[PDB]
Write a protein that binds this DNA or RNA. Structure first.
Lengths: 103, 368, 95, 78, 90, 48, 20, 76
DNA sequence: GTCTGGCCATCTTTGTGTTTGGTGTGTTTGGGTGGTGGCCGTTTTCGTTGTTTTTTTCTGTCTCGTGCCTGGTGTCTTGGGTGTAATCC
């Protein structure tokens, strides 16, 4: 496969077909889908790493949307990247303002 | 003013006196000294004393005497514009009355419900807790009488705008508002709908009670007072003071009665309206009312949404008020002083025409 | 029947590559699939706009790299470009 | 049907938002804001549905209508 | 104190805080003003409810920020209007 | 729409014509209210 | 139309970015 | 008319551009567009700051109003 | 008794996997042009210099406005109190 030749797990043929059928350009070079698959694989690996850390922090062995929301909103770069997206069943970060705390 | 300094065994007091150059915050109309280019002034005197305690007491007593003098002069200035009114003539029968009403401004710091009474030549508010907190308002002194119903607000209102200002407690006011808040704490989907229905019934009952009582005030005036109701559909949002508020047109006035301080602008008293910051790429403009009486300060309504501009221009035209538009906020406090100095020369030149930006009257022809 | 595609198996493989003793719910797998599709769409739209700006008919790896640089923040973009270059060179070196 | 958004529900939403004290007009204000938001979103969704020549509003129409506003939602097939 | 207990309790959970049937009835009432005999997949209503609650929570956070800026604990309609104006919505 | 914007803008020409009449009316009103004799009698607010 | 209206309210024959 | 002086702004732009690639050239219209965008942005920010300052019952704008405005806008 | 935790007795349908199999990616070769490269032109961007004068600046002065402190309201809840109530010698 073309994923094996690049030492990847994401599909190269599928991504090339989606780029081909997406009305992006007249022709598509062969180094674009490999690079884009590598980027997507890196980003999903980062996301899943932080979400697994967050799920272990809660002592769970399965990732739920709550852990994805915590991983996203807790990482500065990801939270800047995913700044407009809302995650169903993600909730909010625990945040109580300083002046509202009791005395 | 003065200062006190301790130095070794001695205490120093410096007393400073009023002189030109080192002037006080007083306006140009009243000087603490007689005008004189050839007059020389004692600007300061510095004294010393071995007795520190007494010299500190003397300084405190001078400072207290100045505070008492300034307070008495402010009290005098606040009383100079209070026209002595006629005495309210009580109705010899059972007066028409409205119970459980609040008054603004409150004559006492404590908010207390009172009863409003209609009499032969005016209205009387009377608190049940103290007989001395009566507020009497003559029909001859009411300029405008507003009724504002409780529809989207939590309160119903009866507002009296006055020709001459009244002393209520410690405050001079042109405005006296009578109001009653319907806001009530009431708590499955049937009970909530019943509470919402009960609140709507209470609002409608209070609006009917206050409207009827306001009509009975207009009738008792023998046609001296018309009852005005605001046109909510013609309302626009703006900032005349420090909060964003809904400004509501009436028949004869532009009003805001919900929040204190109240806005009451009589349309007939307006000479010109100026729309400031009308320029491409701004979200909000300001509206300035200039009055026919140039001694009266201009009224600003700030931060009006630009979506309302064409509506406000139409409304000013439908009311026969001239308007002008400008990209810049003007220094009205300088302009009105120039106009007050010579009103004739102002109209001789062209009058309000200078507000129409620049009168180039020539084709720009910027395109080459 | 309806043979519709997704990224679930690849996300699962990546998860087991990074976290062996951790599972994922179906709703989170759906969210991750939506995330992948979103990021794909963003990158492809940027690449298309760049190609049309530069008057080219082809989407190559240069467009993908510069779209990554435009879209991701500094360290993230740096690591992603590193990964992409590594993968491209490893794929090109062999055949 | 706008009364169905009861006062306790708005209180709950404010407590998850960290709000400690709530005025009495906040409920009507929030109902108005929610009505405006829902009006816009449902109008866009119904536009999508009519274009697709359907009589049923799918989850794809809602997701595309939120993507149109900029409120991208994950986990509904996007 | 119960206010803070509730805040802690609701920033922990993720469950929808609006009852389903009232929201469905509201959605159908609104939709009936654009085209009669419209059908909604249950997932469409669920997505709408998630988006509406997320929007309202973000708005309440901005409102709380404004209220604290003015030095108040109590959120007021003017705070909401100011937040919506600054966002660029009104 | 073009005939309605023409109609609306002709109502806006009447709006402008009214505004021009209002500015000319107030100019003359002010000229009548203030005479050159009042300007000669300047109550200079000499500081009292 | 509205740009012409605004340029005519400023007594100008040429439309400029200000009027837009 | 633009309020920031043109040549100081040019020097600022060049100084900032000196980090991303050494010895860059700039079109004049590029600097003009940058100045227009910067002034429009700052005017909008001062509008929001004025709104916040009025909200606080004040008339003076303070840095915390700017911070609140940038927070609500979603600025980092 | 406050509070975050590590777990429970019961609900619910989910989550990882094997399986059948088919379609979609992968190999092979052929063509046509898009995209690199080189070479030339000439506009335009940087660079400096002199003279003018508007803008910036440093500073002083005064006052107005911001910020702190106060009385009094409404509101939920805890507590001490008492009179209603009453039966036993």
């Amino acid at each position: 496969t073309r994923s094996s030749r690049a030492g990847l797990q994401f599909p190269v043929g599928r991504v090339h077909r989606l780029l081909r059928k997406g009305n992006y350009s007249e022709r598509v070079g062969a180094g674009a889908p490999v690079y884009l698959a590598a980027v997507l694989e890196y980003l999903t690996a980062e996301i899943l790493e932080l979400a697994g850390n967050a799920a272990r922090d809660n002592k769970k062995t399965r990732i739920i949307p709550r852990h994805l929301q915590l991983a996203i909103r807790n990482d500065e770069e990801l939270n800047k990247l995913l700044g407009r997206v809302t995650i169903a069943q993600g909730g909010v970060l625990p945040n109580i303002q300083a002046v509202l705390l009791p005395k | 003013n003065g200062s006190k300094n301790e130095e070794g065994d001695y205490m120093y007091i410096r007393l400073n006196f009023n002189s030109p150059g080192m002037g006080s915050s007083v306006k140009k109309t009243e000087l603490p000294y007689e005008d004189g280019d050839d007059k020389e002034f004692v600007r300061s005197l510095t004294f010393r004393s071995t007795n520190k305690e007494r010299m500190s007491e003397v300084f405190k007593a001078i400072t207290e005497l100045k505070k008492t003098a300034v307070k008495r002069d402010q009290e005098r200035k606040t009383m100079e514009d209070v026209v002595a009114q006629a005495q309210l003539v009580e109705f010899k029968g059972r007066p028409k009355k409205l119970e459980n009403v609040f008054v603004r401004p409150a004559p006492d710091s404590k908010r207390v419900t009172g009863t409003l009474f209609i009499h032969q030549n005016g209205i009387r508010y009377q608190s049940p807790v103290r007989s001395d907190h009566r507020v009497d308002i003559l029909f001859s002194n009411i300029k405008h009488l507003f009724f504002q119903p409780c529809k989207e607000e939590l309160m119903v209102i009866i507002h009296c705008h006055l020709k001459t200002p009244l002393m209520i407690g410690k405050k001079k006011t042109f405005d006296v508002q009578f109001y009653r808040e319907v806001s009530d704490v009431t708590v499955g989907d049937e009970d909530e709908l019943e509470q919402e229905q009960e609140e709507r019934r209470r609002k409608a009952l209070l609006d009917k009670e206050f409207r009827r009582f306001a009509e009975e005030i207009s009738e008792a005036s023998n046609g001296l007072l018309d009852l005005e109701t605001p046109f909510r559909e013609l309302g626009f949002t703006g900032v005349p003071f420090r909060s964003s508020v809904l400004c509501l047109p009436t028949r004869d006035c532009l009003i805001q009665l919900i929040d204190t301080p109240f806005l009451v602008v009589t349309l007939e008293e307006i000479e010109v309206a100026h729309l400031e910051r009308v320029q491409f790429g701004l979200k909000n403009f300001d509206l300035v009312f200039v009055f026919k009486d140039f001694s009266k300060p201009v009224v600003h309504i700030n931060t009006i949404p630009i979506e309302m501009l064409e509506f406000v221009k139409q409304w000013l035209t439908d009311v026969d008020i001239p308007y002008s538009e400008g990209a810049v906020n003007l220094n009205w406090g300088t302009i009105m002083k120039t106009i007050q100095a010579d009103p004739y020369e102002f109209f001789e030149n062209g009058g309000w025409s200078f507000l129409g930006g620049g009168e180039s009257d020539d084709e720009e022809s910027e395109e080459e | 029947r309806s043979r519709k595609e997704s990224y679930s198996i690849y996300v699962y493989k990546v998860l087991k590559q990074v976290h062996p003793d951790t599972g994922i719910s179906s709703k989170a797998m759906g969210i991750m699939n939506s995330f992948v599709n979103d990021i794909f769409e963003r990158i492809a739209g940027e690449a298309s706009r760049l190609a049309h700006y530069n008057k080219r008919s082809t989407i190559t790896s240069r467009e993908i790299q510069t779209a990554v640089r435009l879209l991701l923040p500094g360290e993230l973009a740096k690591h992603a470009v590193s990964e992409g270059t590594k993968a491209v060179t490893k794929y090109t070196s062999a055949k | 049907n706008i009364q169905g958004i009861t006062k306790p529900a708005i209180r709950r939403l404010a407590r998850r938002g960290g709000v400690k004290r709530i005025s009495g007009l906040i409920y009507e204000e929030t109902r108005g804001v929610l009505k405006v938001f829902l009006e816009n979103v449902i109008r866009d969704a119904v536009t999508y549905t009519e274009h697709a020549k359907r009589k049923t509003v799918t989850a794809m129409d809602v997701v595309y209508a939120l993507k149109r506003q900029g409120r991208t939602l994950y986990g509904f097939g996007g | 104190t119960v206010a803070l207990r509730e805040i802690r309790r609701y920033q922990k959970s993720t469950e929808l805080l609006i009852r389903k049937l009232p929201f469905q009835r509201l959605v159908r009432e609104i939709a009936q003003d654009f085209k009669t005999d419209l059908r909604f997949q249950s997932a469409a209503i669920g997505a709408l409810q998630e988006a509406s609650e997320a929007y309202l929570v973000g708005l309440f956070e901005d409102t709380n920020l404004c209220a604290i800026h003015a030095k108040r604990v109590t959120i007021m309609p003017k705070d909401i209007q100011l937040a919506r104006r600054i966002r660029g919505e009104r | 729409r073009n005939e309605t914007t023409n109609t609306e803008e002709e109502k806006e020409r009447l709006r402008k014509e009214i505004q021009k009449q209002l500015h000319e009316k107030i100019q003359k009103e002010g000229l009548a209210r203030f005479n050159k004799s009042d300007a000669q009698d300047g109550n200079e607010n000499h500081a009292v």
